[PDB]
């Protein structure tokens, strides 16, 4: 398995082709959710302290697919590596 | 030998040739469908979702007679009937300018639907099954669209007719008389 | 329900239809208001401290619909996720 | 002297001469393959990966009949059959303009595949083995491509034919009649 | 051997040539993994302290090939010099 450095979350995206009704959307209209697989220790602060992350390994998280989101190939699985800054929420 | 064919119809074909549900005639035959009358021209599938939803959970097919059905919102509609999620047709509106809105309104009266006119404070999303017209059958080919026997009440129809009948009275020009009758 | 991370406010947009007089405005003339549904703990500062947010769950808030505002689909409800930076004001009483 | 020859085929050769799997004839003989019908022209191997993947784990070869197979996405396809990872052929689409999409559709019907038309809301990546046609055998040389005995059901075929049969009825020009029959 | 300044990691890239399936990609499409060869002391903080790096010499690391990644020629080997910021993970 992979290791995250400093503050990085490793996530795998999910899904959907359809909408609210099952009405299939076109690839102008139609993902921002994913599952946490590995988490870094935390950010290192100017005072030397290491702030832990508020995302545990195995949350369903809503993230911003920004510039800082990078893509990787792991065991032939599509994964994403982003900083915790790019995570917006959790689904509990 | 000589031959007579008989049918409301107007000069507009399907926008999407991938809708023909009977390749025998090369035409779309929508059985007992709903009818959406959009004054504005459609380009995004967002606007459709609310109404498309209620038609998808109603079972009945749907005819969409708007100013135009643009690619982004057309593309989708195709793959939805392609698969059998909803049965939908898309055809341009009969006419040009103020005559189009006038004719588009005629269809609403024959079918018991509401013209979803963007100009007079209506969004296409805030339409429901309420605002859709209905007909006994619909037939559309490469050139013409035909609505056979609409749900609209004959009171509203003949009221709408005796109105257009007196529009031809005040027609001081021959051309204004042609298109009215 | 959803959870906000760090400093994020989850809001739902609204719309009045009428003006100063009751003269109904058209959807060219009339949105930047919304209601708070969920709030994050706060921003984390360089000194490690966690600053709480000044928006409580259930304020009517005026926000800037900037770049940082993202859209989500929740129970089939149109919601928005933005940082507290993007909130400008509150409508009280 | 006079001469009689017996044979669906169209005037297009392989795009990649490094595909010929039988240098005897100087032609590619794909045994019982899948068939990908791409309306748009391909330049990136990204789009292919999803479908190419499912064909690589199916064992069967694949014919790719798109508007064109550009270098970046061609280059790769070659080294993949070069090695034996997948067995793939690339040929341009038969025709030009609206006739191409029409003819490309004919092939889908004979093979039981779906035309992956970018215009009507389909991405090439969202295709699966589902949307691929199939044939008993395929033969492609420098000049022509031949699909021998496609999987498509004769219902859908003769339906598609009686449609094109009535397209020749409304043909008011001789040229519109030629290419249809 | 080379020396890293402040916070710099010296890495050598590997290859992947293949994709999701094993379908070999062309040098328009195709690597983000590498091996650590030398590491700097650390970043220097406003209080004068020197924060050590969390990457030891000889990790297999996943990095972002950003703007801050520079190229060098060492014994005729292709090597990279990047800051620890550009390292995202370790493969253990």
Curated annotation (Swiss-Prot), chains A, E:
Belongs to the GroES chaperonin family. The lineage of its organism: Bacteria, Pseudomonadati, Pseudomonadota, Gammaproteobacteria, Enterobacterales. It comes from Escherichia coli (strain K12). Gene3D superfamilies: GroES chaperonin. This is Co-chaperonin GroES. GO terms for cellular component: cytosol; GroEL-GroES complex. NCBIfam families: PRK00364.1-1, PRK00364.1-2, PRK00364.2-2. It comes from the Bacteria. Together with the chaperonin GroEL, plays an essential role in assisting protein folding. The GroEL-GroES system forms a nano-cage that allows encapsulation of the non-native substrate proteins and provides a physical environment optimized to promote and accelerate protein folding, probably by preventing aggregation and by entropically destabilizing folding intermediates. GroES binds to the apical surface of the GroEL ring, thereby capping the opening of the GroEL channel. Regulates the ATPase activity of GroEL. Heptamer of 7 subunits arranged in a ring. Interacts with the chaperonin GroEL. Can form asymmetrical complexes, composed of one GroEL and one GroES, and symmetrical complexes, formed between one GroEL and two GroES oligomers. The asymmetrical complex is the functional unit. It was suggested that the symmetric heterooligomer may represent a transient intermediate in the chaperonin protein folding cycle. Another study shows that the symmetric heterooligomers are substantially populated only in the presence of proteins that cannot be folded by the chaperonin. Keywords: Chaperone, Cytoplasm. GO terms for biological process: chaperone cofactor-dependent protein refolding; protein folding; response to heat; virion assembly. It is found in: Cytoplasm. Activity of the GroEL-GroES chaperonin complex requires Mg-ATP. GO terms for molecular function: ATP binding; identical protein binding; metal ion binding; protein folding chaperone; protein-folding chaperone binding; unfolded protein binding.
From Swiss-Prot, chains B, D:
Its main location: cytoplasm. The keyword Isomerase applies. Phosphorylated reversibly during heat shock. The modification N6-succinyllysine is found at residues 92, 136. It comes from the Bacteria. GO terms for biological process: chaperone cofactor-dependent protein refolding; protein folding; protein refolding; response to heat; response to radiation; virion assembly. Keywords: Acetylation, ATP-binding, Chaperone, Cytoplasm, Isomerase, Nucleotide-binding. One of its GO terms (cellular component) is cytosol. It is found in: Cytoplasm. GO terms for molecular function: ATP binding; ATP hydrolysis activity; ATP-dependent protein folding chaperone; identical protein binding; isomerase activity; magnesium ion binding; unfolded protein binding. The keyword ATP-binding applies. Forms a cylinder of 14 subunits composed of two heptameric rings stacked back-to-back. Interacts with the co-chaperonin GroES. Can form asymmetrical complexes, composed of one GroEL and one GroES, and symmetrical complexes, formed between one GroEL and two GroES oligomers. The asymmetrical complex is the functional unit. It was suggested that the symmetric heterooligomer may represent a transient intermediate in the chaperonin protein folding cycle. Each subunit is composed of an apical domain that binds non-folded proteins and GroES, an intermediate domain and an equatorial domain that binds ATP and is involved in inter-ring interactions. Forms a large central channel that appears to traverse the entire length of the cylinder with no obstruction. The central channel of GroEL functions as two cavities, one in each ring, that are separated from each other by the crystallographically disordered 23-amino-acid C-terminal segments of the seven subunits. The entry and exit of polypeptide seem to be restricted to the apical end of each ring. Modulating the volume of the GroEL central cavity affects folding speed in accordance with confinement theory. Small proteins fold more rapidly as the size of the cage is gradually reduced to a point where restriction in space slows folding dramatically. For larger proteins, either expanding or reducing cage volume decelerate folding. A stepwise reduction in cage size results in a gradual loss of cell viability. Together with its co-chaperonin GroES, plays an essential role in assisting protein folding. The GroEL-GroES system forms a nano-cage that allows encapsulation of the non-native substrate proteins and provides a physical environment optimized to promote and accelerate protein folding, probably by preventing aggregation and by entropically destabilizing folding intermediates. Belongs to the chaperonin (HSP60) family. This is Chaperonin GroEL. It comes from Escherichia coli (strain K12). The lineage of its organism: Bacteria, Pseudomonadati, Pseudomonadota, Gammaproteobacteria, Enterobacterales.
